[PDB]
């Protein structure tokens, strides 16, 4: 088990991708999953050990291109919207 990275996981048939951070959500005395408003498996309990891993989807993002008219010059400035680009 490796965390804090965008990983393709498989928890007893639970298939998906994201970051599996370590979160203290709640007790989960006998429940395994963690749900939300949608059909989202927000939290998962490990099959081997017993810990509450929190699933967060990988970063989205749209790309926009600042550019003057191509008559003037050819340099451009890329903008990745809603991306905390400490990681490109």
């Amino acid at each position: 088990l490796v965390k804090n990275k965008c990983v393709n996981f498989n928890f007893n048939g639970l298939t998906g991708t994201g970051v599996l951070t370590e979160s203290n959500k709640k007790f989960l005395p006998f429940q395994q999953f963690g749900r939300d408003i949608a059909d989202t498996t927000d939290a998962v309990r490990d099959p081997q050990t017993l810990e509450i891993l929190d699933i967060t989807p990988c970063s989205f993002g749209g790309v926009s291109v600042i550019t003057p008219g191509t008559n003037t010059s050819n340099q451009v400035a890329v903008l990745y919207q809603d991306v905390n680009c400490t990681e490109v």
Binding site: A38, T40, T56, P57, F60, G62, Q81, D82
Partner: peptide, 22 residues
């Protein structure tokens, strides 16, 4: 302001004019 009180391919763009400019 006081009286006035997701990850599946949808985003919310921020307005061009922040409340300070307004």
């Amino acid at each position: 302001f006081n009286k006035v009180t997701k990850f599946n391919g949808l985003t919310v763009l921020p307005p061009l004019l922040t409340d300070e400019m307004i």
